[PDB]
Amino acid sequence: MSSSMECSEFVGSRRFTGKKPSFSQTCSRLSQYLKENGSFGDLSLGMACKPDVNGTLGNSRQPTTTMSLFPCEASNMDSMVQDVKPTNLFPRQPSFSSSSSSLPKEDVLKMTQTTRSVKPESQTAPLTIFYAGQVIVFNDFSAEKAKEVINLASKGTANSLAKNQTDIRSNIATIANQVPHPRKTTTQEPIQSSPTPLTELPIARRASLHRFLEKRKDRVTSKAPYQLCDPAKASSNPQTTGNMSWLGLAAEI
Amino acid sequence: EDTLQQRLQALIESAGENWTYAIFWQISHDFDSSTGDNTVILGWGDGYYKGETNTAEQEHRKRVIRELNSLISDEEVTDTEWFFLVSMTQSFVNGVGLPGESFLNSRVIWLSGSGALTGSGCERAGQGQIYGLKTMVCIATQNGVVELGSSEVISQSSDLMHKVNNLFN
């Protein structure tokens, strides 16, 4: 079959580039920014400003936290649509929404496995969250999943939920208590000021990729950015020896 | 606030070492109707920063900084600037936390080095250690607590507490 030829072409394409064009793209993106205007003397004080009014203004602004990176500022979206022409990688019927259980575990699996991707340090677990009502008087999950949870709990006697076998499920619910709409503000949805729509990208795939990039972020949290070059010469300059100013996965160490 | 601003800036201008910031925690009294206790609470009084991440954090910080600029009237926001800014939101019951411990016992508390910071058990010192600070000092005064922070490692100088006692009542 022709899948092997396509995989060979993909390996051939990736071996040429390897690391330098992506690195150069990211560096170019960083270089253009921060060149508009530098104050160098502006100081933010707590005297003229007030913490209470700051909190109210922060609450008033929407969205408080940027759900996705702005497409107009940086062409992140171009890479996604670079070689994706419709290609329904969920090959079951679209509107993957309000379609309840009768959600088999194998319907994402078929396309994803074949992709020959990054090794599965991917948790590959989706935190489906259902907020039944705005007021909190409801069974605290969807009923179809809830009855299965009740059956497993009855097997386990449902004594203490604190000593869970896997703490990831308990933690992720605390981490994200919201759907792709942050606060349901009247003006949150009617916005026509971001001049590059995401072309209705699926929330679940974006969220999984985003949280795996947040695992990349927490591993990126280091005491010093340049451990190797710190003993030789340490100084403060508004210049960068490395344009990326960070490193990714280790090549051979 | 302006006079206290001047005196907090004066405190670090004559300082022998390189202190990153200075914060005056201010006493107040709220009437808790349940216990009937006029509880003393430390809160943000004033502050003076002197000084020397990923995309989402820096965009959040730059958004906050330009919101403040819009209020008063685009460089990157270092971890010390952001710790200084987020410290304005915190309040401290007397005895609770590092400034409340300094105030309640009228003593100087000197946390020098990231080991001391992480080993002290104060959450503010830990968050400061995460955000680049190496030295945190709380000195009790008559009307509040003077807190100094620095990214360098500084050992106990009596000259600092002397300056604090001189410039403040």
Partner: protein, 373 residues
Amino acid sequence: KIEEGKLVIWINGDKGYNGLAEVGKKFEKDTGIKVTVEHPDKLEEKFPQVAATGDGPDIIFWAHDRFGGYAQSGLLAEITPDKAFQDKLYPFTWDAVRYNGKLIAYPIAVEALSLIYNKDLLPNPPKTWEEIPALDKELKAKGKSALMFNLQEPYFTWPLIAADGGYAFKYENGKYDIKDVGVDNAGAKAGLTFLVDLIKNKHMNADTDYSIAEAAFNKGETAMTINGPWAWSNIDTSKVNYGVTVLPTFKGQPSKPFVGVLSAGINAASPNKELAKEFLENYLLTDEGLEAVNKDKPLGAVALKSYEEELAKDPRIAATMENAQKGEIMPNIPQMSAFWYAVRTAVINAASGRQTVDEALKDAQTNNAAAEF
């Protein structure tokens, strides 16, 4: 950004902007450089906002009391007059515009409030505030009133407040004590209480502002008003046989109006500082430039010494300087504007009846004290 090669000047709407425009037309005839004079509303609040971002006028005319605050934010350039030009203006006019040792804001004129009275309705104006209600009980019999002035601006209500005591900031040991504010002492409470009593007994209306009181005096409906030289002015049109005299005394002590120095400041962000210097020093602050401005709207006792012989020909200037003799030069410290706002609040809640005198002056004191603390 301010356009290079021309001058933009802001001046208050009650001042001589057409005369200033004629001086600017003389500047345009001599140098080819155009001068645009504008008079926006709330310019003393709009100026620091646009000036902080590098915009605004090249030159601003205003009383000196705000300019030190403009000095603190870096909004004004340090001026460079030579000794010969400094010897052309009065020494106290230079003393009023000093902030932190440095000269700013070229002095234009000295202003003080006076009592303006209708000689036909009232040939003998009263010497005391206390006889104003009883006089007001007679003119209402003839369909007139005794006194109407702007109660919305605390500058005009300060002489009654300042008479029996009360002050802006305490001056001691060669410095100001900004935490010692005198808005709630016995004299200030007595003055504001007397004003509120004048309003309660229907001798004046709390809603009366500058335009209504000016229109009322220009139609012969009220026998007195309290204002400076810029009212003369179309009171000059009105042909009313008017006189200008001393403010009334209160509890045996004279009224103490703030004495203002109208001054010309140069924006630090202006690229036309030398052109502004040449315009202000060599054309405006001359006999003919000040004459041209005074013919539009009289400035009062201008700072130019050589015009003083002309000043002696106007007895209304003598009355203005007699009121100035019984008053005080305003401080120029940056907190004064917030001070004005607090006093602006203190009158309006008292005048309308929504707060008592004690509550309003207490609120002003807490406002100021919280601002320093």
